[PDB]
Design a protein around this ligand. Sequence first.
Ligand SMILES: CCCCCCCCCCCCCCCC(=O)OC[C@H](COP(=O)(O)O)OC(=O)CCCCCCCCCCCCCCC
Ligand SMILES: CCCCCCCCCCCCCCCC(=O)OC[C@H](COP(=O)(O)O)OC(=O)CCCCCCCCCCCCCCC
Ligand SMILES: Nc1ncnc2c1ncn2[C@@H]1O[C@H](COP(=O)(O)OP(=O)(O)OP(=O)(O)O)[C@@H](O)[C@H]1O
Ligand SMILES: Nc1ncnc2c1ncn2[C@@H]1O[C@H](COP(=O)(O)OP(=O)(O)OP(=O)(O)O)[C@@H](O)[C@H]1O
Lengths: 224, 224, 301, 301
Amino acid sequence: SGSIRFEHVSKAYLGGRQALQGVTFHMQPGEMAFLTGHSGAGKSTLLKLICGIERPSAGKIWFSGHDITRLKNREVPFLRRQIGMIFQDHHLLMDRTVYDNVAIPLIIAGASGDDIRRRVSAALDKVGLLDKAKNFPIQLSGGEQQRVGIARAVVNKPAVLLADQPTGNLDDALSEGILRLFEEFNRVGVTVLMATHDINLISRRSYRMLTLSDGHLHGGVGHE
Amino acid sequence: SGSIRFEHVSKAYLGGRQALQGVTFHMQPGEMAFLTGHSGAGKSTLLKLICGIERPSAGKIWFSGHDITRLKNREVPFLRRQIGMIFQDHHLLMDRTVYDNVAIPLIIAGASGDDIRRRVSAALDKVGLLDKAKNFPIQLSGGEQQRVGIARAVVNKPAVLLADQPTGNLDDALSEGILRLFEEFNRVGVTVLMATHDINLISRRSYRMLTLSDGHLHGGVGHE
Amino acid sequence: FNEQVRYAFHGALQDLKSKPFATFLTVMVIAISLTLPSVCYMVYKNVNQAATQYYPSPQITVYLQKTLDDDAAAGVVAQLQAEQGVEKVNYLSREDALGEFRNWSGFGGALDMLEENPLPAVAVVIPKLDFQGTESLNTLRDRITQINGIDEVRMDDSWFARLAALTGLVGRVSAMIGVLMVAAVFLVIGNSVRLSIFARRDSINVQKLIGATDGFILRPFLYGGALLGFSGALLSLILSEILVLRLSSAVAEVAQVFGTKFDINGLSFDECLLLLLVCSMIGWVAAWLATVQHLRHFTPE
Amino acid sequence: FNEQVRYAFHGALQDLKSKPFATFLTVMVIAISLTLPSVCYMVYKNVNQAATQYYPSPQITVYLQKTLDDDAAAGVVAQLQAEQGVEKVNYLSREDALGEFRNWSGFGGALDMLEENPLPAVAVVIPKLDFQGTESLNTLRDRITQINGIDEVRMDDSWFARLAALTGLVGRVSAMIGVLMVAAVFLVIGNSVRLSIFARRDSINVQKLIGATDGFILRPFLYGGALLGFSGALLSLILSEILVLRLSSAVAEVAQVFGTKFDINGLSFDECLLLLLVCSMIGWVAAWLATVQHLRHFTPE
Ligand SMILES: CCCCCCCCCCCCCCCC(=O)OC[C@H](COP(=O)(O)O)OC(=O)CCCCCCCCCCCCCCC
Ligand SMILES: CCCCCCCCCCCCCCCC(=O)OC[C@H](COP(=O)(O)O)OC(=O)CCCCCCCCCCCCCCC
Ligand SMILES: Nc1ncnc2c1ncn2[C@@H]1O[C@H](COP(=O)(O)OP(=O)(O)OP(=O)(O)O)[C@@H](O)[C@H]1O
Ligand SMILES: Nc1ncnc2c1ncn2[C@@H]1O[C@H](COP(=O)(O)OP(=O)(O)OP(=O)(O)O)[C@@H](O)[C@H]1O
């Protein structure tokens, strides 16, 4: 399965603000939904809880039926291995080429040398960075660095895709192309959860609309 | 004066692509214009040439009537001091509090202790981060980290404002608030040149619009 | 080798190649801090050999009864050589003692006019090193006295005790000095590897976020620390050998003045391999301790 | 203090307090690398004094004619004392020379059978300590022979050069060790500051982009480098003080055996100030060289 379930999840940072309060929702496998909210609502915190980067202060979290509320540090790397994550700051390896950045998840999975070459180039083609493979991340524009993170998150055909403003940069023409890339992955059966501020992109689709406000979640059309 | 003038400017990075080919335009002091283009068109490179960060391979650049195409390294700090620059990566000091990040332009100029406290707090109020003064930049969301850089660029009442996608993050409601903030400075007489991808934001204004396409500049309504 | 081992080694080697001068400075610092104890140890090894081989250590100087002749004195010498704490005994007759008496005085009027030789037989005994202790030599001189035909042990126990105190002091000081140099090697190698990793702690966080295990992350850093310790130790072996050649002329000159020929001995092949192997382990452990501290820092809870 | 000085000092000081253990390790590395030559200088200083004060260095011997008496010998002694390069002159009569002969022999009591003393008067002249050059001693001895009433001027010759050769060898080895210890101090302090600054090179880039001058950027790093050298040097003074006390007891037993009293001389106040001042300058220059490299790296062209 690839489902996600939240039951009264609440997260409070160490000595800081209360990021979330009583978040309760569940997502069927293969379902695509949008996450929205004002700046500082807690969209990135919600995505981090699912991936396991942060642990909730209350409530329980289920990933594919497994309880990941309190996971041992040994078991965490085998949870994030099934999740395609895109960050806000693009979290790149500045001392490695574009090819090395995209190929690292495959190496962790221990793929063969020939298969790495074919799959990496195919991923870079989907975002239009094929000729940038030999470059370093410092020699790329703001939108080009962002598209490297997207390519890295889709090489390993993950079960769940978590996107944190994947089109903050990039023009509207290129942003729609990136959205269509997630569409075809969803048709295969990948669960996609996207957080964004682009009103125009959302208005052109009809997916589930998860609205987050001051750490409180609204299910949209319904909590079902 | 706060005018900017280009004359057949062309930039080509070391061993890389020709970012700009024969850009030629000028801006009268106190006018506000938008800079738009597809990803990789060279918007950030154009702004870096004005700031003196990059030196053009050809042509001449005039800043307030002073030729800066071949400025010596000694005179550079006295040019960037007159420019309020907002970067794409927010370029923050991660080991200093939010208050210290916004106050560093004033310390360089050498303001008094009491004056710094009043001006920094006023600037953080304009972006809504007043209660975030004692936090570190790692303790802020992507939207709030972005707004810290905006506040840093408006404390020192700069003659020219260069914005590199100041609303990549932030929701639509907060994006309008930032845009209105720039318009307030423009009414005083500050020249504003902002590069953005938000076509929705531009549609609600009627300012001069500059299109950059594959390194070739188009003046929009006219080159005047 | 394993495929991931090959990947880790190439990644570790690429970092050092990326910034040449900075890497060279780190290797140079380690090399100098290792040349210092290597040279001093070489001095200690060579000085110990010369002292054991060339120092005229105090002699027992057994005195025999004057009534005994050469044949009876030789029997006493045989009894001396049969003792547990005796390595070798050399015999000098009464006339031999008279010959040394004439050499010191330089005048024959103090010995020739006597009707008989007033000097007793002298036996030179070579004591064993383990039996050259304070209590052992005291016990040895008693057993020598108990041996028939011996009436005096000319050994003084004053110069022997005085020389013993200086040896104890030099060993005490050299031990404290040697600890500081060894302790400096651990800190210099440990701190250099610790600071090198700290500049790259961002890559540790990025790899951990995409699901890499701790073992996967550690290997490139572990091999980097071992290479740094190995490279620094290897360079010092070149420096130590060079400093021998500078001192080769000086030592030969001193040996020429004394007449006796002496040659300096450098580090053996076994010691060279041990130095490389130990320094690599220090870098390996330092890299393991530094990286694990970062992996715990990025843990959410 | 100026407002820019206080802000730079406060910013530099806050960086050290941010990560205590990492700063503590860097200070400990510098402290050990400075204690090593601090103790070895103290060992050299005390040994040099003790050898000058206590070692019976070989002397110059003058033999008088057998026909002279003590009164005539004293006149020769007076002539010896007035010569340039002579520290003091000692005299031994004919009976004194025979008395020492009797004391060494023990069995030399038969000398009383002689009608007259065969040994002539012996005079001892100590050359000036700074005038003990090989050529100077021969020149002095030859000039001494010109004095009337001298039968022979005697020098140990071989023992003079042999002792001089060994001392010269100690000088070359000690000088070789001293350079290595000094070089290690320069490299350890320089490399520790260089790696510390490299981890903060992103903050240098940010300040340049917002218009900060090179002088403004340098100041926080210059004060941080000087503090590391000052903190490390100050700590090594405590370690040197402690290690003296450990060796102070040991020297007492050695002095007790010889009976004569000797005391360990530590580092004077002037030496302590010089060590603190020099190490602060090294950190200042090291922090200046490292920072200028990054400033030149971030310039466009
Ligand atoms: C890498 C550097 C290693 C340095 C090693 C130094 C070895 C010294 C070899 C030269 C002298 C040997 C011949 C002397 C013996 C002889 O002639 O023969 C032995 C003589 C007496 O015999 P004779 O009366 O027949 O001449 O002994 C002496 O004259 C005095 C004893 C000399 C013993 C010296 C041993 C210690 C020397 C330490 C010097 C190095 C100190 C380094 C700083 C701590
Ligand atoms: C920081 C720690 C430094 C320690 C330094 C200690 C110096 C020696 C202190 C004790 C010396 C007492 C000797 C008294 C001599 C006497 O009374 O008597 C002096 C006698 C002769 O006079 P007498 O017949 O009257 O006794 O001389 C001797 O017997 C031999 C000469 C001894 C001179 C030794 C000087 C060098 C010692 C070096 C040891 C340290 C080496 C350190 C490693 C390189
Ligand atoms: N590391 C952190 N430590 C403490 N508080 C944090 C941390 N990260 C975020 N916060 C706080 O948690 C709240 C929500 O932050 P979060 O990053 O989840 O927001 P977001 O919805 O992604 O917002 P944005 O669109 O501005 O990026 C804010 O009050 C923020 O200051
Ligand atoms: N430091 C650099 N070295 C080499 N090439 C660079 C560098 N920075 C940018 N480039 C290249 O120059 C071109 C323009 O880059 P620039 O950053 O100016 O784009 P941009 O218009 O800001 O784009 P975006 O929408 O991605 O932010 C691109 O081809 C980019 O890869």
